Design a protein around this nucleic acid. Structure first.
Ligand SMILES: Nc1ncnc2c1ncn2[C@H]1C[C@H](O)[C@@H](COP(=O)(O)NP(=O)(O)OP(=O)(O)O)O1
Ligand SMILES: Nc1ncnc2c1ncn2[C@H]1C[C@H](O)[C@@H](CO)O1
Ligand SMILES: [Co+2]
Ligand SMILES: [Mg+2]
Ligand SMILES: [Mg+2]
Length: 422
DNA sequence: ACTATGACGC
DNA sequence: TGCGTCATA
């Protein structure tokens, strides 16, 4: 139960299964229980894929691959596309579905919304209460209909394995020690089973969850048994789980830092970090990242679940590749205006719904020839929620950046974001 | 030339 | 602070 072994909390991560697909299926019943996908608003090669149904994943379909190329592998494949507005994607439908789920989770515990379809939950308090109200009654497997215990058992049919693993887990749980970490996780999974049932009952959406002692393990556990299932990862299962867990699959190590770890230490798996001393890790990744790595490879992490439901920023952007790159003043003014209008639309609802106002406008662009996501970013005061004014304010700041008569090189990206709410 | 939000260091 | 860079859905 110690902080020392990082078994001090019960944390869960809930993520909706093929979220965009499910949102479309709720509107159109005919799309249910059939292989389908959702492509971006642009139609070329059938459109880029962002969300794929599980039925369709069986045929090998993935996101980030062309729709028509996906078609060949799964000809039965049904397609849904993001509605278009002001020349760009319209995600209102999904954002609205997102709100539904979040309000339901917030009823069971305060949450930390981490993305449009997932949120972390700190269930530590709720678990104590459940242990109080239970009054010593045992936990039957019937309260965990969709739970997988990572690492078990030791020694369609897949359902048989799940229950056997679940039974050995339950048969070895502490009965008298209410502060037993494993027992705490188990109760946390019970609460999550209820939470997920409510989400489905009230919205029809299905999802998965991970229950463990920290955000990193909870997030990792969540992807272990998808879809419509939840996974419990105990501290004792970590050595085994990490023995062959690719380093880049761990939260915050999917990019350069993670690549750097693989490269500098000559390892591929999380479990291999264990052989290094904390000082070796600090001398190579820094005091802070070194200590974090030292503890994380042992299943220990302390980032707290921070209650957040409201976005810290609201923004939108658009890319204009190749021929399309924005060269003239007319072009840049118009697209800035389209973006600012979407911004105004969202900021308005934001103010109507949450009584806060953005005081700052951030403008970001990318000039043709630049490999980076964004070439530069600037900001200015956001006094009025007026799209025309904001468009001109944004234009003035990008005009300042730097051929004094047109844009050379041209812009391949425009970005507007409202922040500094108060 | 295949499309959002959040955090960190300084 | 404001900004470049990094992380990830
Ligand atoms: N790179 C991207 N660009 C645009 N939209 C994206 C995106 N990544 C995800 N989305 C949109 C599309 C998604 O529907 C949604 C959720 O992202 P996930 O949770 O990553 N993926 P899903 O829910 O689909 O499947 P499951 O979790 O079961 O694996 O956000
Ligand atoms: N690579 C990383 N990804 C995410 N968070 C990290 C990373 N390295 C250090 N930290 C954090 C965690 C601690 O709470 C804190 C140490 O005081 O800093
Ligand atoms: Co004007
Ligand atoms: Mg998802
Ligand atoms: Mg997600």
């Amino acid at each position: 139960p110690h902080m020392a072994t990082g078994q001090d909390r019960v944390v869960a991560l809930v993520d909706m299964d093929c979220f965009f697909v499910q949102v479309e299926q709720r509107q159109n019943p005919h799309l249910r229980n059939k292989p389908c996908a959702v492509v971006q608003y642009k139609s070329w090669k059938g459109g880029g894929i962002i969300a794929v149904s599980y039925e369709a994943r069986a045929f090998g379909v993935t996101r980030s691959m062309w729709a028509d190329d996906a078609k060949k592998l799964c000809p039965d494949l049904l397609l849904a596309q993001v509605r278009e507005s002001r020349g760009k994607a319209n995600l209102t439908k999904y954002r609205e579905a997102s709100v539904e789920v979040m309000e339901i989770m917030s009823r069971f515990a305060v949450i930390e919304r981490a993305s449009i379809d997932e949120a972390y939950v700190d269930l530590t308090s709720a678990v104590q209460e459940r242990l109080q109200k239970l009054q010593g009654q045992p936990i039957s497997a019937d309260l965990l209909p969709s739970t997988y215990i990572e690492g078990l058992p030791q020694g369609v049919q897949k359902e048989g394995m799940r229950k056997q693993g679940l039974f050995q887990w339950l048969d070895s749980l502490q009965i008298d020690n209410l502060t037993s970490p494993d027992l705490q996780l188990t109760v946390g999974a019970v609460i999550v089973e209820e939470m997920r049932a409510a989400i489905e009952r009230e919205t029809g959406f299905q999802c998965s969850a991970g229950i463990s002692h920290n955000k990193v393990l909870a997030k990792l556990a969540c992807g272990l048994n998808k879809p419509n299932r939840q996974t419990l990862v105990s501290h004792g299962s970590v050595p085994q789980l990490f023995s062959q867990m690719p380093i880049r699959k761990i939260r915050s190590l999917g990019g350069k830092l993670g690549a750097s770890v693989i490269e500098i230490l000559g390892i591929e798996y999380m479990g291999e970090l264990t052989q290094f001393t904390e000082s070796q890790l600090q001398s190579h990744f820094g005091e802070k990242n070194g200590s974090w790595l030292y503890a994380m490879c042992r299943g220990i992490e302390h980032d707290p679940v921070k209650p957040r439901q409201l976005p810290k920023t609201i923004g939108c952007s658009k890319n204009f590749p190749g021929k399309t790159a924005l060269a003239t003043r007319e072009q840049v003014q118009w697209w800035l205006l389209q973006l600012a209008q979407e911004l105004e639309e969202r900021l308005t609802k934001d103010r109507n719904d949450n009584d806060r106002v953005a005081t700052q406008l951030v403008v970001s662009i990318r000039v043709q020839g630049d490999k980076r996501l964004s070439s530069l970013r600037r900001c200015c005061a956001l006094t009025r929620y007026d799209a025309h004014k904001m468009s001109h304010d944004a234009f003035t700041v990008i005009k300042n950046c730097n051929i004094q008569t047109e844009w050379s090189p041209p812009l391949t990206m425009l970005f507007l974001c409202a922040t500094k709410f108060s």
